[PDB]
Every structure is written in C-alpha cells, then in structure tokens.
Symmetry: C3
Subunit: 114 residues, 3 copies
Amino acid sequence: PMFIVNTNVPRASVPDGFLSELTQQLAQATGKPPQYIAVHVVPDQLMAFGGSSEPCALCSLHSIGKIGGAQNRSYSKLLCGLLAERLRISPDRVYINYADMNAANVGWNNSTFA
Amino acid sequence: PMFIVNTNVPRASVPDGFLSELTQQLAQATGKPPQYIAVHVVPDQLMAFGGSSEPCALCSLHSIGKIGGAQNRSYSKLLCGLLAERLRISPDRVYINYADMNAANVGWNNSTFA
Amino acid sequence: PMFIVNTNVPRASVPDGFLSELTQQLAQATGKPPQYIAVHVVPDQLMAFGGSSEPCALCSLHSIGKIGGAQNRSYSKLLCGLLAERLRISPDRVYINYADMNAANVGWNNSTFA
C-alpha cells in the first residue's frame, strides 16, 4: 500500500514519529505486512478545501486489493482520526482517493507483482 | 472534486486569488457546490515536458461523476485557459488526468461518500 | 506519457541530465515521441518504505495505452535500473503505479486526446 498526504499544515506541526505511526496503523488496517507499506507526507502546501485555507488534507491510498466499501469506511475513520489528532485537521476537510491496483500495474523490485 | 496542478512556474508567479478562482470556476464547470471543491497548486517543480523546461503543468481532476468525453473537453478548455492567463503556461504544455471516482472510493469525514 | 518520481533522496543527489535521460529512455520504452513525454522529479520528501527512511521512491507512469503485463515488467526493470544507478535507490524500495489512461480522460491543449 501507498499512502500520500498533502497538507497546508506546516512542517513543524507534523510530529516526530508520524510516518511510523501511519505505517503501523495501515499495516494493521489493511492486513498487509509492514514491509509493503509506503507513506509520504507533504506539508506546507498551497491548497484550499471548500474555498478555505484552514487546515486540510488531500490524500490517496493505493493498494493491490483490500479496497472496498466497508474497508474504505474503516480506513477513512482511522486516517481522519490520525490527521485530526496529530495534525489538527478537521475530518470534514479531508479527502482520500482510494484506488484498487491490479498487481500487473504495480512495479517493484525490477518487475511487477503479477 | 479535487484539482491538483504541479508546475515549474515559481511561487511568486502564482497570483493572489488563484486558488479561489480555480475553486469558483470548477464549481461552475462541474455543477458541484464550491464547498466540495478542493484545489492544490504546487509551484517550483523540477519537471520537463517534451524534453524542455519552459513553463508546463501536470495536473489531475478527480470527481465523483461529471467526467466524460464532452465534459472533459470543456474542463480542458477552461483549465488550460486559466493556466495560460494566470501562470503564462502554453496549453500545449499542459496534461490533465481526469478520473471518475466511485463514491465508495472517496474518503471524507471519517467515512466515504457512498 | 507522464512519469513522476517522489523520493527522499536530496536534490543535490539528482544528477544534471536526469530529466532528459528519463525523457529519452521513456520515449524509447513506450515507443511514443519524446515531445509527448513529461517527467517530474520531487526530491527531499518526507517518506518511508517498510517503516524505513532509507532511500526510496514512489512513482507513477500514466500512458494512453502501452501499459500491460509484459510492458510494465520491462518498464519496471528500466526504471528501477535508472533510479538505482542515478539516485542510488534500491529496486526493492521503489513502487511504480502504472495507469492506462483512456484518451478521452487526458486533457491537453484546450481539449482531450479523444
């Protein structure tokens, strides 16, 4: 899985340990081994949500499987919870694009997962 | 809807008011309320388009519906127009990826739009 | 085609000529003219792969066609090779998301490619 968070929250407001926390919580929620989880946080961004520049986040979660209606609801509760708690971003100012990737469409280690 | 623009144009060349203009015009084009429109501009990027580095933009528009042949032509005219007028980027150095998202695959406010 | 590389490797480690090399190699690999190839490198990112902050890369290749099982294995060998050689990133710390775009869903030059 690959989880990307883009936010206008400044770098100094991203707490130490945030990437590890994301990694651990995602391994668990998705059921995948931690070794396959990639995380990326991009602070200080020029962005708006609903016209407003109050704290917000634009995110994505790509994964080979483990994407679906109920699963995505559960990821959203988790991720929004973490963004609220750690970055002080309101959940209603978060968007997460979920994408179910075909194994043939993910390159890794000189090949793909197909 | 979520609109992202990645560009090599420098931050000081992004005019005041640009995120609001993008929010307004995308609300109108998509028919969605401005409160649901998110915009993100990423200047000063290391990028090339067709081998050169004159001003260019790599963008995406993710929307739940309102994506299709004619609509996307219309979004491209609008968005290329705005990038040309405000960031001085030639339309033939703009790429926009359009993604029609299923409501179950967009997280927001601790759940999805399903 | 559009190729994007997000990496924690620092900007100074990205060699001069890397965008042109990517452009040329992708033109050859995809068979598309270099005028249609866009490349974007984002260094100094806050990211982790497998919980580790050792060098890694999160990438994507969007193309109208020329995406598939065998092709993507080949692109992954090529791309991982280049990231290892030029950025010193281990291939098993690289993810590449491949997306086969419909021509109607790519905006360019005030219209789409449809």
